[PDB]
Symmetry: D2
Subunit: 440 residues, 4 copies
């Protein structure tokens, strides 16, 4: 599953539909990024630029011109064909091939952007520009507008109105097409296979980074070359650090390991967390905490649907957590009073859910306290956790346990679809999986 040229075109048209007549929208590619000295990190296109193009080159700018309510057209600035640069560094789309390949009306050399952009903006009323997104983009836009402002003797005029297109575009991204959902479904499947693999490979004495290796290899084999975020493999006390990415420790017999890892497939993020015993068997204490987190996730999966909210479902999770922690003696007091005091917060200190898409922590308005009413097409994670610090004032057997369990879902007309349920999470199923692997 992928996103095709015609869909990128529909998206451009949908933006144009929302634009004022006599306007242009400017969407800039990501800069290349230094890793060390003359070596660069593998290129990652800006998500918004990608959303409108599927074009994976730097030094590119998409310009959507809405001349009036019936007439509009698109211009791409992109790197020129150049035999020598291409022999050295890779093929470039160039100007001749871009209109057919991408479905844009015209293509111009990026080297000419300062000579040409002001001409495209001249006489327009509105420019849509994500001011502050990139310095290099701001320089180009500001220079063009300055030429126009100062060019009255050449009969030039600048658009006086600049609108940030990010709110409009991010609202677009928040609601996935069926094609996007298909891509995300595949990202979920790939990511789940990687997590299953990690559980089947994990043995005491392996390093945390070994599981990262297994996961990344599995992503790659299905054509997801890169993770969507830096893989977290937190064993023992490291599981209590939320974005632990050092992954440097030897995994101990008797500890849990928390793996938060997700692929990037055709630009879209998977995002799964599973926590499991390094030795394949939960201790009683580990199981007692695990059961609370799992009940939290299972209840959330039953509840998530159009018409509820992240805030509302979070309330149910908080009650499950406080109730369970009281039962174990980690919290003490009346459940309702403890809920009113947000007494869970030392142990569950992050959000239950974030949007998911071209970014793992995806764009889109949540509403105050994530109260926005859910609707079909929204894609989000569900990631309850409990983290009991090594020095927590709690019964000793619970100290140093960090557990999170995370699935990716899409809101549907009738509830939700779980994209990541193909990797097990019931503790008996985790144990069975690991027992079977450990016998081989």
């Amino acid at each position: 599953s992928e996103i095709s040229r015609q869909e990128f075109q529909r998206r451009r048209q949908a933006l144009v539909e929302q634009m004022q007549p006599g306007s242009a929208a400017l969407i800039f590619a990501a800069p290349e990024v230094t890793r060390s000295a003359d070596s660069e990190y593998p290129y990652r296109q800006n998500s918004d630029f990608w959303y409108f193009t599927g074009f994976n080159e730097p030094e590119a700018v998409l310009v959507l011109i809405k001349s009036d309510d019936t007439h509009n057209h698109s211009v791409l600035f992109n790197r020129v064909r150049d035999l020598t640069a291409e022999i050295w560094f890779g093929r470039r789309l160039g100007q001749d091939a871009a209109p057919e390949k991408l479905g844009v009306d015209r293509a111009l050399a990026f080297s000419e952007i300062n000579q040409q952009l002001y001409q495209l903006l001249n006489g327009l009323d509105v420019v849509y520009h994500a001011q502050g997104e990139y310095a290099y983009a701001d320089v180009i836009v500001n220079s063009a507008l300055e030429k126009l402002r100062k060019g009255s003797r050449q009969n030039l005029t600048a658009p006086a109105t600049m609108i940030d297109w990010r709110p409009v575009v991010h609202e677009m991204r928040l609601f996935k097409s069926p094609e996007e959902i298909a891509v995300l479904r595949r990202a979920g499947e790939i990511t789940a296979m990687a997590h299953t693999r990690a559980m089947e490979k994990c043995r005491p004495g392996m390093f945390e980074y070994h599981l990262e290796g297994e996961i990344h290899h599995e992503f790659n084999r299905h054509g997801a070359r890169y993770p969507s975020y830096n893989t977290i493999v937190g064993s023992g006390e490291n599981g209590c650090i939320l974005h632990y990415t050092e992954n440097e420790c030897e995994m101990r017999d008797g500890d849990l390991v928390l793996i938060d890892a997700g692929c990037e497939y055709k630009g879209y993020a998977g995002d799964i967390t599973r926590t499991f015993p390094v030795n394949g068997k939960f201790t009683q204490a580990q199981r007692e905490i695990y059961d609370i987190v799992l009940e939290s996730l299972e209840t959330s999966l039953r509840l998530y649907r159009p018409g509820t909210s992240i805030l509302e479902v979070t309330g149910e999770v908080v009650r499950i957590m406080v109730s369970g922690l009281v039962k174990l003696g980690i919290l003490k007091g009346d459940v309702d009073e403890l809920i009113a005091q947000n007494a869970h917060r030392p142990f569950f200190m992050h959000g239950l859910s974030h949007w998911l898409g071209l970014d793992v922590a995806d764009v889109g308005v949540y509403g105050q306290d994530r109260s926005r009413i859910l609707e079909p097409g929204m894609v989000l994670t569900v990631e309850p956790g409990l983290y009991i610090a090594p020095d927590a004032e709690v019964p000793e057997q619970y100290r140093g346990i960090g557990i999170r369990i995370e699935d990716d879902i899409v809101i549907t007309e009738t509830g939700n679809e779980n994209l990541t349920a193909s990797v097990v999470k019931k503790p008996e199923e985790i144990e069975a999986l690991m027992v079977a692997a450990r016998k081989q």
Copy 2:
């Protein structure tokens, strides 16, 4: 093998030895780098900062103060301990533990750098600063000097002399310690194992990126989490693109595949290229080009020693290449005249060798045309190649063949040591390896 605290300390002392009395050297950590939106790329420390610290955090600055010819001391600015930031994002060394851990005299919070740096520079004659390396560093240094310049009424004075320490430090890095050579030897071994694996796994129908996956997994399993540069897997015509990193094509029965890949192990780069038949058997045409590149490499490995140069060895390679290309009818004319015309350049268009170390294309002065006389302790690659474009005006059977073969060596008292000879390169040995793998 690794680099220890005491070696980082020796390096600091060696720099101090070269500094003027009444001076301070300022060495800044790399900034964190955005991948997309709120996600960052895995952190890569600045090589020079790493060279003097082995410290893998951002927002850190090493200050070496040489008060006079006998008295000197070190101050580290680094991120403070903070419970909440650490629960979220990972452990921090902090100020209390840094002096013992890193072997620095004093540690201060990075948040206080603007309040403290000018006080350390006050009254000194010279500041050593890599101006232009990082914007954030320049801002900090310029602000401190400005406070001093403008602070005469507070009895403050700025050092009037600013010296770029990069030439001195890069000359240090150019000559490896035995401990560095041991690390590089391990990087070579790890990298060679990965290349052997790629040859043993490669089958027609696999994608180029599948071999990247095998390689990266092998790096990881030996504790080299990241590659030292973006992996190149160029099959068929893609082999004729030097830094081809798309790795997106299905590998065809009958094509060669060129793999240029290297691990990063304790900060140090491996860097190997092997080219081999996708189907395990060189065609006659492929073998004829391969033999010339291999002879070029083998001769270079015999010749590299103290007292010669990259330029001198390159001359021998150019003769081998021109001679071989004349024999095959790719070039036509007198060998000596063709050499004088640099007639090889359409087919071998890059350098034979680069320095290797904390950066894959390592720091250090080459001399004009890479004429610098080689000495023991220098580490460099040897990477002849021939690239015959799909549309080259040559006998048709050679079109679309890209071959490079690359080893990493260290110059010794008696010649050189090859760090990467544990992955095969003789064509009969490549074929034997692949035949054996293909039977399993």
Copy 3:
């Protein structure tokens, strides 16, 4: 005559009337400007900021908030009262006194602008900001918007729309109130007195700068402390340089002197040019050129009225000039053909008229080729000139003559009012004035 608090308030209200509901307009003061080292030039307030405040301090920002269509209010950020800074550098208005003094609703310390501005913009739909006017202003505005964009978890939201208020405000400035016209009338009178003085003082052997001295002294004595632009005193060949401000030469018996000088009175510019003989008597050649320029000015003054344009009146001037130059043998050919060839341009190379107000070359849209139809309330200069270079291919007696004659006018319902006719320009009147002065 001056501009009062109530008028500044009317202007603010007129801007608010044009703003969208749910918006704020930000108007920034001019920065102080270095002359040399620690000395600054005399402060000149930004014209737009002045237009809305009459407030002559730096580090000030006017914020007009239009909450909805009935409710609006104003906030001034300005420098705090500070005993020590004031003993040293001068009195400051401060926050307590500003609301009554300026007629703003609230005043806050400029030192708090970053802590407060984002709070004022939070939740608004539109921000009006002159992007690119001042770097320091852009930094403040961009920082506020960034805080809002990134502050969703604190329930903050940025206005997505930024509108340049300069076109609206400049259109306001283009049409003067009766009170503005009274101020400009006084500026014209002061400026005319200065020019009369220069003619009465001028003698061969005086330096060009001596006339500058007389002029500036006259401005000062009427309470116009500063000129509105750098005074031009171009004698002989220097008269052929349009913005000659060196004023360094000894004025020669037999040369003309061209003086272009204007006061700044309560923020408003006078702008007069007179050219006259250094020795009090035009030569025949000087008179012949002078007569053409004077006829050009006199005709323009008869013609300027509502319903014509600068372009239209310029056409009449071009015919007068070409006709006169043909008569003298400076141009050769058919007048209509010469007009069609713009043959006047080597000798009259600048515009006939510019707008006049808070800036000497005042703000406001001219239309293509200055074709905008004139309306009552517009204020403009009328400044024909002829400049015959020392090496021009013309009858020798005309070489090195530079003549311009410039008056300031206001368009009225019935034509125009000349604000600067109280300094003579008829050649016989110039000669009479100078003869009378030279006898004293």
Copy 4:
């Protein structure tokens, strides 16, 4: 008196003498400065650039190249001749005429600076650059060094050492040549004539700015077109504000007026303060304060000589002030104890002396607490004052009196020469001068 080409050349050579072999010094002109919109302030050349050139254009850079200990040469970058730009804006020196006019070896177009500067710096060991003086200069220098650093394949090398030339040049400026002293002597005479004029013109009912007008006119008539700093005319309570420049008040019968004003003559500053009765007669209270300030100045003028210091002479002044204030009941207690408590500071809160030269507050190292030992050739002001605030807790008759009296001196072998004693300061002489003027 002026500074000639040969002296500018001697200065360049004196700098070169102090430079390391294999180095270049870069001295940049001041940028033009906006007053409002398209109008600029009158150009003021950077003092250091002026010191080495006497060249009054922007977009100019002096480059002094010291190839080795015997060979050196100079290159000027400056604006090209351009007929059209010159007709519009003024004559330019250009490249052809600059070598002879300025005594530099070569001149190049400023438009070519980026193409040429790196070529001049290539292979040098040291660059002398005033980092942070001007943004535009830093951009040019940083760009050149970056080209060199990155140009090893083009056999380019950057100087690794950057030295701020300001300390060396400012030490040069601190010691005046006889020719500089002659210019400063004339500046003192011009400035004194202006102050005499102000005293002779002052009448109750005139505005403070009227005296500014008289002063500026007098500067101009002697060929000092501009003041060296913004003129201060502080009458009554305004005299208690140190840099009062509003000069907006009507001068009252019975008040003092303090005038601090100085011309700029051939780049050099005069700097005189005189305080006198608006009505020509000191009141008893005014005289009592005046006498203390005058005794302070007269004693300072007797004492200033080689071998003492500003700090030492200040001690004598503090004793005079404390003694006098005790006598009048403004201070109460033991004189020595009051001195130890710095009890004078509420009334005399500024320094007695600053260096004087191309800047009014001239460059040069003062030493801690201005303790540097004075030597012949140093030029400084002597400016005791007493300022009794309107609300001071002192006998009522002294409230609102601000008095300063300031002369400019040059340290000589035998003491000092007073450059400004030609304007009176003894109270009986002030009264006589004013009485005589008031009778006319």
